[PDB]
Amino acid sequence: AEMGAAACTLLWGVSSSEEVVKAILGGDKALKFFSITGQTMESFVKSLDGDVQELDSDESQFVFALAGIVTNVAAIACGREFLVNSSRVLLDTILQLLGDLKPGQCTKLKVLMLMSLYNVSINLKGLKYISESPGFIPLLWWLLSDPDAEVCLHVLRLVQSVVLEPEVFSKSASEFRSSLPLQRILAMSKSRNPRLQTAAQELLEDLRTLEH
Amino acid sequence: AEMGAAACTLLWGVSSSEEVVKAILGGDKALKFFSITGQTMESFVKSLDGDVQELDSDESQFVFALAGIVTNVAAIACGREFLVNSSRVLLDTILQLLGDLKPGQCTKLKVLMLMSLYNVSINLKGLKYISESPGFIPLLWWLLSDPDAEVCLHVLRLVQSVVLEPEVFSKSASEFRSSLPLQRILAMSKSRNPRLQTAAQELLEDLRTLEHN
Amino acid sequence: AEMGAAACTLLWGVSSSEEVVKAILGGDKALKFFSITGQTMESFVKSLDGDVQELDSDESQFVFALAGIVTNVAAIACGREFLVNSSRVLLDTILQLLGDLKPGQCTKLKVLMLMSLYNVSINLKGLKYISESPGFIPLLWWLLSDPDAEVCLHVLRLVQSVVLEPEVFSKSASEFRSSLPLQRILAMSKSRNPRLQTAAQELLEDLRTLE
Amino acid sequence: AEMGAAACTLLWGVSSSEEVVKAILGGDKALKFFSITGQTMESFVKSLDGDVQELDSDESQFVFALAGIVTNVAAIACGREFLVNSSRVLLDTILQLLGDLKPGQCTKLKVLMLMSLYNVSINLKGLKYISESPGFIPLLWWLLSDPDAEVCLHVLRLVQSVVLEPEVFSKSASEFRSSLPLQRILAMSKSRNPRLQTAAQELLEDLRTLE
Amino acid sequence: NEFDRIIENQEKSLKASKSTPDGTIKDRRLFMHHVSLEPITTVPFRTTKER
Amino acid sequence: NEFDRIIENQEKSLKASKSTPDGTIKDRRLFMHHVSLEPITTVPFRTTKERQE
Ligand SMILES: [Mg+2]
Ligand SMILES: [Mg+2]
C-alpha cells in the first residue's frame, strides 16, 4: 500500500522526460498499466462517498501519481497518440470521474485529470474523442461551478482548446460556443485570482473573435 | 497489488538509463523507496516455506522488479555512491537474504542480488562495506555450493572484485587461504560454459599470483 | 521499390541498437509494421513461381532488410517478448515460408528467417510457440536436406535451442530428441565445413547428454 | 507502397536521436537514401492537382517521413555537415520544391522543409550554399506571402539565421534590402501570437540596424 | 563541434528544431495567429515542505 | 567518477551489470553448465558490388 505509492511517485517524477514516456508506451501491453490505472482511479473515488479530501494518505498519493503519470504521458506527442488509440477506456474513466466528483471533493485529483484531458485534446483524434463524449458540455458547466479557482482555470483551458481548431468549424463548433456558461466566464474574467481572470479573459477574447 | 507491481516493473525498465537513475536519486522520495524495498524483499523471502516460487502473480514479479531496480541503480556511479551512503540497511538486507536463501531456492533473486553487490563493490566505500560485513567469506564459499551455474558465475565475479583490491583483501586474510573452495573453483575452470570457465580461470590466476607475489 | 528497400536497409542498420528496437515496438500500433512485414515476405516468395532468387535486386534486399529487422528486434529481450505476444502471425508466416521455400531457393532469406526463430526461442513462450507449431519436426527434416551449409547450421542451432531447457522433460522432450534425423546430424558432424561440423558435434553432445 | 511509408515513419521516429543519426551516416546505403529522397519528394509535389494540402493514407505520410528525416538529420552537427558535403542535390530539391509549392498547398511539408534549411544553415558551408542558391531572396519573400503563420515563422527564422553572421549578409545586402517587403514584414510585427511576435521583433532589431 | 557557426552573442544562439511523426501528423497545428497551445508536464508534490 | 575503484590494469576492468524485466523474467535461463545461448544481431548485406573502403 505504502510501497505501491512510493513506486508510482518515482515513476511520476521520471515520466517528465520523453525518453521515459516512450519506454512506458509498449509496457502497458504485458502489464495492462493504463487499463488497471483507470480501475484504480475508479476504485479510489468510489471508496470515498463522504469526506472532501483524505490528503497525505498513501491511497490519495497513489492516485495522484497515477493521474500525474497519465498527464506526463499525454504531454508527449506519441503518448497522447497512444492514449486515444489504445487507452480510450482510461479517457472514459477520467471524464466519468470528473462528473462523479462533487464540487470541492478531491480538488488536486480533478486538476491533474483536467490537465491530462487538455494534453490529449492537443491530438486531433483526442479533441474529437473528448468533445464527443457523453454529457461533455453539462460536465464543463458542472466543473465551472467548483469554488476552487485552479479547477475553474483548467476547465477554461480545456474549453479554450475545444473552441480553437476547426471541429469542421461549420455549425458543430458554432453550437458549442452558444452552449457555454458565458455568464460564469464573464464573472471569472473579473476575478480577483489573476491566473483565473486572465484565462477567462483570453477565452472571452477567443469567443468574441469567432462570433458571427 | 497488481497496480503496485506494474509500476515497479515499469520503473525497472526505465532504470536501465543513467538519466533516469540520476532523476530517481534527485527526487526527495528515493530514500523512503530504498528503505521499504529491503523490508519488502525480506518479507517476501521470510514468506517462502521452501517450495520454489511458482512465478507468484505480481508477487515474485514485484520483488524481482525491486532487486532489478536496485541492480540498475548500483550500475550507475552516483547510484552505487547513493546506496553506500544512504541505503546501507538495504545492503545489509541483500547480504542477509543471500545467506537465508537455500541453494536452488529463488535463483533469479540471488543473481539479481549478487549482481547488485558486484556493482556496489565498484564504488570504493561499497567494496569496504560488503567485504567487512559479518559472515561475508563464509557466505561466498557457501553460495559457490549452489548447483546453478549463473549463481556461481556471479559469486566468482564478486570474489574477483574484492580479490582485485589486495588492500581490502588483506584485511580478510587467513580465511581466504583456509576456507576457499579451491576444488570447486578448479572444476569451474573446466566447465563447457566459456563465461563461467574463464571467470574461474581468471580468479585462479589471481588467487595463485597473490599467494606468491 | 528502390526507395522502399533503401529505407528498410537503413532501418536494418540502426535496428542493431536496443534503443532503436524499443522505439520500433510502439510504432507497430499505428502502422502495423510486423503485420505488413509478413505480408511482404509472403508476397515475395509467392512471386518466385517457376524461379529461384535473383539477388543484387531492389526487391531481394527489401525482404532481406525485413527479415534482418525481425531478427534484430527478436535479439532484444523485450523484442522477442513483443513478437510472441503481438506478432504471432508474423512467426506463423516465417515458419510457413521456410516450408514453402524449396531447397536451394532464397538461401539468404532462409538463414535470416532461421536466425529470428532462434532469437524468439530464447523467450520461454517463443520456444513453446515455435516447437508446438504445425509440421515443425517435418520442417526441421526438410530444412536439413538443404545443400547449403549455412542453412543447415542455423537449423542445427535452432534444434539445439529446442533440445536444451525442460520442455516438461517427461517424454515431451524425450520424444522430440528421438524423432530427429540423427543420421544427417551424424553426417554433418564429419562435415568439411568447420562451422557446420562444430554445430552438429555440439548438438550430438547435447543429444547424448540428455539421453 | 504502404510498407515503404511504415519503414520511413519508424526511421523518422528514431532519427530524433543523435546516436541514430551518427549510425545512419555511417552506412553504405546512406548516400543512396538521401539521393532517392529528393527524387521521391520531387515526384510527390509533381502530382498535386490542388485537391487537399496532403491526400493522406501514406504517399503524403511517406514524404512527410522523408522531410522529417532530413530535418532530424540536419538537426545533428555531423548530419548537417554530411548533407552539405554529400547531399547538396537534395538541398537544391528542397529549395526548388519550396518555390514550386503554391501558398496554402502542403503547408506541413513546407514547414518541415524550412526547418531543415534552417538546421543546415547552422553549418558554415550550409549557410553559404543556401544563401548563394538561385532566386533565394525572391523565394524568401514569396514564402512570406503565405497565409499560414507557421510557414511565415520558419521563413523569418531562416532569414534571421542568414542576417546573423554578417559575412554572408554583406554580399546579398543589395538584393535583400532593395526587395524586402515592408507591407508584409512590417505588418507582421503584430503582437497576435508570441513566437511570431518575437520572431519579427528580433529580426527588426538586426535588419533595420545597419550602421 | 567544428564546421558549424558558433555565434559570439550567447543571447541570440542558434537552436535547431526536431520533428516527430505524431507531432507533425497526429497533432493539431496549434501554432496559430491567435496563440500557441502547449502541453502540461506535472511534477510530484513536495508535501510537508522542504527541509 | 570521483569515487569508483579505477583499476591499474586495462584487461582487469570492472564492468557493471544491468537487468531487464523481459530478460530476467520472460527469457529462458540459458546460462547453463553445458553452454550459454545468446542472441544473433545481423548487419546489412554489403551487396555483390563491393568497391573497397
Ligand atoms: Mg457517472
Ligand atoms: Mg503453405
DSSP symbols for A46-100? HH-SS-S--TTSHHHHHHHHHHHHHHHHHTSHHHHHHHHHT-HHHHHHHHHHHHH
* Structural element, H or E, at residue F38: none
Angstroms from A132 CA to nearest CA on chain B: 30
Angstroms from C90 CA to nearest CA on chain A: 18
* Contact predicate A109/A132, CB 8 Å: no
Question: D104: which 3 cell numbers?
Answer: 496554402
Question: B96: which 3 cell numbers?
Answer: 542477509
In whole angstroms, what is the distance from residue C109 CA to residue C64 CA?
A: 6
Cross-strand partners of F36: F31
CATH of the domain at A102: 1.25.10.10
In whole angstroms, what is the distance from residue B77 CA to residue B126 CA?
A: 11
In whole angstroms, what is the distance from residue A110 CA to residue A97 CA?
A: 8
In whole angstroms, what is the distance from residue B80 CA to residue B72 CA?
A: 9
Question: B154: which 3 cell numbers?
Answer: 556471479
Angstrom distances, CA of residue A150 to CA of A75, A96, E45: 19, 20, 16
Nearest of D24, D142, D43 to residue D87 by alpha carbon: D24
Best A17, A32, A76, A78 member to test C by mutation, with max C CBs in 10 Å, is A78
Give the number of other Cβ atoms within 10 Å of residue D179's Cβ.
12
CA C23 from centre of chain:
23
Which alpha helices (DSSP H) does chain C contain, by range?
2-14, 18-27, 33-47, 60-74, 77-85, 88-100, 107-121, 124-131, 136-144, 149-163, 174-178, 182-189, 194-209
Question: C147: which 3 cell numbers?
Answer: 545443400
B55 CB within 8 Å of a chain A CB: no
Tell me whether chains A and B touch (3+ CB pairs under 8 A): yes
Left, alpha or beta for F17 (phi > 0: left; psi -120 to 50: alpha)?
A: beta
Nearest of A210, A192, A183, A188 to residue A200 by alpha carbon: A188
Cross-strand partners of E4: D123
Cell 515499469 identifies what position? B10
In three-state secondary structure terms, F36 is strand
In whole angstroms, what is the distance from residue D17 CA to residue D22 CA?
A: 9
* Contact predicate D2/D65, CB 8 Å: no
Q: Into how many domains does chain C fold?
A: 1
Angstroms from E1 CA to nearest CA on chain B: 23
In whole angstroms, what is the distance from residue C161 CA to residue C150 CA?
A: 17
Backbone angles phi, psi at E4, to 5 degrees: -100, 150
- Helix axis angle, D88-100 to D124-131, nearest 10°: 40
Find the domain containing D195 and state its range.
5-211
If contacts are CB pairs under 8 Å, which of residues 4-33 in chain C contact chain D?
A: 4, 6-11, 13-14, 17, 19-20, 23-24, 27, 30-33
In whole angstroms, what is the distance from residue C155 CA to residue C118 CA?
A: 9
In whole angstroms, what is the distance from residue D75 CA to residue E20 CA?
A: 13
Cell 536496485 identifies what position? B70
In three-state secondary structure terms, A123 is strand
* Structural element, H or E, at residue D115: helix D107-121
In this structure, chain E runs to a length of 51
User: Residues of C with CB below 8 A from D30's CB?
Assistant: 10
Cross-strand partners of E36: E31
With an 8 Å Cβ cutoff, are B7 and A7 in contact? yes
With an 8 Å Cβ cutoff, are B14 and A23 in contact? yes
Angstrom distances, CA of residue E10 to CA of A97, D115, D125: 48, 21, 21
Angstrom distances, CA of residue D1 to CA of B55, C10, D6, D58: 45, 17, 9, 8
With an 8 Å Cβ cutoff, are F42 and C12 in contact? yes
The letter for the amino acid at B73 is V
User: Residues of F with CB below 8 A from B9's CB?
Assistant: 21
CB within 8 Å of F42: residues ≥ 6 apart: C12, C16, C68, C71, C72, C112, C115
* Contact predicate A175/A167, CB 8 Å: no
CA D59 from centre of chain:
20
Question: D44: which 3 cell numbers?
Answer: 510527390
Ligand nearest to the CA of C134: 2
* Contact predicate B110/B158, CB 8 Å: no
Angstroms from C73 CA to nearest CA on chain A: 14
In whole angstroms, what is the distance from residue A64 CA to residue C40 CA?
A: 46
Left, alpha or beta for D7 (phi > 0: left; psi -120 to 50: alpha)?
A: alpha
* Contact predicate D137/D172, CB 8 Å: yes
Give the number of other Cβ atoms within 10 Å of residue B96's Cβ.
18
Tell me which method was used to determine the 3D structure.
Answer: X-ray
Backbone break loci in chain F, preceding residues, C–N > 2.5 A: none
In whole angstroms, what is the distance from residue C196 CA to residue D68 CA?
A: 45
Ligand 1 centroid from CA A99, angstroms: 6
Question: D143: which 3 cell numbers?
Answer: 514564402
* Contact predicate C10/D36, CB 8 Å: no
Cross-strand partners of F27: C123
User: Residues of C with CB below 8 A from D90's CB?
Assistant: none
* Contact predicate D123/E3, CB 8 Å: yes
Neighbours of chain C (3+ CB pairs under 8 A): A, D, F
Nearest of F35, F28, F32 to residue C157 by alpha carbon: F35
DSSP symbols for B26-93? HSTTHHHHHHHHHHHHHHHHHH--SS--TT-TTTHHHHHHHHHHHHHHHTSHHHHHHHHHT-HHHHHH
Ligand nearest to the CA of C45: 2
Question: B42: which 3 cell numbers?
Answer: 525480506
Tell me whether chains F and D touch (3+ CB pairs under 8 A): yes
Ligand 1 centroid from CA D63, angstroms: 45
If contacts are CB pairs under 8 Å, which of residues 11-50 in chain E contact chain B?
A: 44, 46, 50
DSSP symbols for C126-175? HHHHHHTSTTHHHHHHHHHT-S-HHHHHHHHHHHHHHHSS-TT-SSTTHH
Question: What sign does the dihedral A154-A156-A159-A165 (CA atoms) show?
Answer: negative
In whole angstroms, what is the distance from residue B69 CA to residue F20 CA?
A: 9
Question: D105: which 3 cell numbers?
Answer: 498547398
Angstrom distances, CA of residue A63 to CA of A38, A67, B4, C82, E47: 10, 6, 11, 28, 15
Cell 561475508 identifies what position? B136
Question: What sign does the dihedral B16-B21-B23-B28 (CA atoms) show?
Answer: positive
Ligand 1 centroid from CA A96, angstroms: 5
Angstrom distances, CA of residue F3 to CA of B21, B47, B83, B161: 17, 37, 13, 16
In whole angstroms, what is the distance from residue B68 CA to residue A75 CA?
A: 28
* Contact predicate B205/F46, CB 8 Å: no
* Contact predicate A109/A64, CB 8 Å: yes
In whole angstroms, what is the distance from residue A24 CA to residue A75 CA?
A: 13
CB burial of residue B123 (10 Å; 0-12, 13-18, 19+): buried
Angstrom distances, CA of residue D165 to CA of C63, D74, D133, D136, E30: 48, 19, 17, 17, 32
In whole angstroms, what is the distance from residue C62 CA to residue C41 CA?
A: 9
Angstrom distances, CA of residue C79 to CA of B20, C19, C84, C95: 21, 11, 9, 18
In whole angstroms, what is the distance from residue A67 CA to residue A62 CA?
A: 9
* Contact predicate A70/A94, CB 8 Å: yes
- Helix axis angle, A124-131 to A107-121, nearest 10°: 130
Following CA atoms A48, A97, A34, A166 in sequence, which dihedral angle do they give, to the nearest 10 degrees? Answer: -160
Angstroms from E8 CA to nearest CA on chain B: 30
CA D33 from centre of chain:
19
With an 8 Å Cβ cutoff, are D81 and E24 in contact? no
Following CA atoms A148, A150, A156, A159 in sequence, which dihedral angle do they give, to the nearest 10 degrees? Answer: -100
In three-state secondary structure terms, E21 is helix
Work out the angle at residue B168's Cα, subtended by the Cα atoms of residues B165 and B170, and round it to the nearest 5 degrees. 105
Angstrom distances, CA of residue B60 to CA of B34, B54, B104, B107, C122: 18, 9, 16, 12, 21
User: Residues of F with CB below 8 A from C56's CB?
Assistant: 47-49
Which alpha helices (DSSP H) does E2-50 contain, by range?
21
User: Residues of F with CB below 8 A from D28's CB?
Assistant: 44, 46-47
Nearest of D194, E42, E37, E30 to residue A157 by alpha carbon: E37
Angstroms from E32 CA to nearest CA on chain A: 9
What's D183's DSSP letter?
T
In whole angstroms, what is the distance from residue B111 CA to residue B122 CA?
A: 17
Give the number of other Cβ atoms within 10 Å of residue C19's Cβ.
17
User: Residues of A with CB below 8 A from E45's CB?
Assistant: 61, 64, 108
Give the number of other Cβ atoms within 10 Å of residue C157's Cβ.
20
The letter for the amino acid at F27 is D
Give the number of other Cβ atoms within 10 Å of residue C59's Cβ.
17
In three-state secondary structure terms, E4 is strand
Ligand 2 centroid from CA C105, angstroms: 15
Nearest of C101, C82, C66 to residue C18 by alpha carbon: C82
Work out the angle at residue C137's Cα, subtended by the Cα atoms of residues C132 and C138, and round it to the nearest 5 degrees. 130
